[PDB]
Each structure stands twice: as structure tokens, then as C-alpha cells.
Design a protein around this ligand. Structure first.
Ligand code: FMN
Ligand code: FMN
Ligand code: CL
Ligand code: CL
Ligand code: CL
Lengths: 136, 136
């Protein structure tokens, strides 16, 4: 019914790409980020907290996927999207990332959790083909 | 307020280690498992669904961690535990895995989500040191 602190501790440490964001604060900013997340994105820790993950997007990013994400966030749905993200140095990578809407015993969204997965160009091609085939 | 099907689709496919279990069914069995999960554990798909993840544990698995997990499950808490797990061939590996309690708009636990991470022996040593230092 709550959050065991083991979750929060192993999150900041896990060599994979995890993030947690707080909807209670404005703009839903990152409160905890994994070490593998900083390895993948290349950012320092001070450039992560207090900000929303929009800084991973850029020019060549599919805005339909971004609208999908923001709709699922406004409704608090658990989703997953593959899109092109940018590191700090400007390099690009295909991020297939998940979003979970953790809710308390009252049904209210307490925190958002995000798992990012770097996928190859073949997986990106197939999943983008499906997502673009999802036309209305 | 619901589960976007993108979550379920990208779960079964993601090359990482994800699982989802249904508390509505007896013993809380696995309903969806990732491809990377089958790569890590070595099991076929038919040996996964309809079963609880106890088949990953074994002889030299810390039972205190298992009691911790089952208490957090009975209370529906989001946790994370590092423990020794076994593959199908009998080989061992240190699994630092997370557990999230997805709840609906009414606060009831709908499904459990689990992310497994294979960690080295140094990380296992440090985290097991902390968890054993957690004595009452
Ligand atoms: C927990 C969480 C993790 C997210 N991770 C990413 C990410 O890794 N890459 C990305 O492009 N967007 C990510 N997003 C989405 C953005 O943070 C943002 O919500 C998205 O751009 C839609 O919001 P907007 O329409 O206001 O721009 C994540 C969102 C959440 C809640
Ligand atoms: C979603 C989910 C994923 C789990 N993944 C693992 C796992 O990877 N390895 C493991 O040893 N136990 C895992 N467990 C815990 C076991 O499934 C089981 O709940 C645990 O042994 C405690 O239950 P018990 O006291 O009845 O044995 C997971 C549990 C859940 C709910
Ligand atoms: Cl379905
Ligand atoms: Cl091994
Ligand atoms: Cl090692």
C-alpha cells in the first residue's frame, strides 16, 4: 500500500535505465534516476532532477508518439513507446521505454516510473511501422 | 486509469527481463513474460505461465528475503530485493529484481510487475551486506 524503501534505493543504483517522476510537483519532474540512466543519456545528476524528460527529445522525434505519451500521462495509463531520443553530446538512439502509473490505496497516481531500453534499428523499424500503421 | 495495450505488447517482446503476474488468479501466476526473461532464465514459454516465480529460487536462496517479498506482496508494496536465483540448467545468478503493485482507480491491486537485473558479485556482496545488516 506504500513504497518499500528498497525500491527507491535499488533504483538510483541499478545499472539499467530507470527513472521516477513526481506528479505532485509542477511539470512532473524526475526525483530519482538510475546510474545506467546517466550512462545512457550522458548527463550528470544535477542536469536531471527537477526537470521533465523532454530534454531527451529533439528535432527528429515523432510528435505523434509524444502526444500519445502526454495523453496516457493525463489519463494515468501504463504505456510503452519507441521513439528517437538524444543524448547530451547530441548523438541519437532509439529508446523503447515504458511508463507505469503507480497508484496508492485510494487510486490516485503517486509517482510515475519509467524504464528505458536501447533497441537496434531493426526493432525500431518494425515498431515504428506498427505505430504509424496505427492511424486512427 | 487502465492498461494501454502498448505496455502488454512491448512487455512480451522487450529484450530485458520483465514479468507480469495476476493476483486475481490463485497463487498469483505469470500471465506475460519478456523474451529477455526467457533468455536469462533459460525456460521455454510453456514452463512460465500459470506458475509463480518460486521456480527461480532454490537451496542456497536467502529465505529472509523471500519472507520480505511475500510480506510486501501481502501488503501490496513496491519493493526490490537482491537474491540468488537458479536457471533451468541449474546454474546460479544474482538477481536484483523490482516489484511494482499496479493499482486501478479504486486502489485495488490489479497486476504485479517485475523487473529482473543480473548483478555482479560485488554488487551482490554490498547489497547482501546491507540487507543482512537490516536485523530488526
Ligand atoms: C516516468 C517517465 C519517463 C519518461 N521517459 C522518457 C524518455 O525516456 N524519453 C522521452 O522522450 N520521453 C520520456 N517521457 C515523456 C516526457 O517526460 C514527457 O511526458 C513527454 O514529452 C510528453 O509530455 P509533453 O507533451 O508535455 O511534452 C517520460 C515520461 C515519464 C512520466
Ligand atoms: C511480479 C513478481 C516477480 C517476481 N520475480 C521473482 C524473481 O525473479 N525471482 C525470485 O526469486 N522471486 C520472484 N518473485 C517472488 C516469488 O514469485 C514469490 O512471490 C516469493 O517467493 C514469495 O512468495 P512465497 O513466500 O509464497 O514463496 C516475484 C514476485 C512477483 C509478484
Ligand atoms: Cl489484452
Ligand atoms: Cl552464471
Ligand atoms: Cl562477477
Amino acid at each position: 500500500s506504500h513504497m518499500d524503501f528498497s525500491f527507491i534505493k535499488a533504483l538510483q543504483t541499478a545499472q539499467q535505465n530507470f527513472v521516477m517522476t513526481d506528479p505532485s510537483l509542477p511539470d512532473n519532474p524526475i526525483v530519482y534516476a538510475s546510474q545506467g540512466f546517466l550512462n545512457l543519456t550522458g548527463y550528470s545528476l544535477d542536469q536531471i532532477l527537477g526537470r521533465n524528460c523532454r530534454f531527451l527529445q529533439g528535432p527528429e522525434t515523432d510528435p505523434k508518439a509524444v502526444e500519445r505519451i502526454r495523453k496516457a500521462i493525463e489519463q494515468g495509463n501504463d504505456m510503452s513507446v519507441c521513439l528517437l531520443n538524444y543524448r547530451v553530446d547530441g548523438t541519437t538512439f532509439w529508446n523503447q521505454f515504458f511508463i507505469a502509473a503507480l497508484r496508492d490505496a485510494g487510486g490516485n497516481v503517486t509517482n510515475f516510473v519509467g524504464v528505458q531500453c536501447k533497441v537496434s534499428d531493426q526493432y525500431a523499424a518494425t515498431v515504428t511501422k506498427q505505430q504509424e500503421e496505427e492511424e486512427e
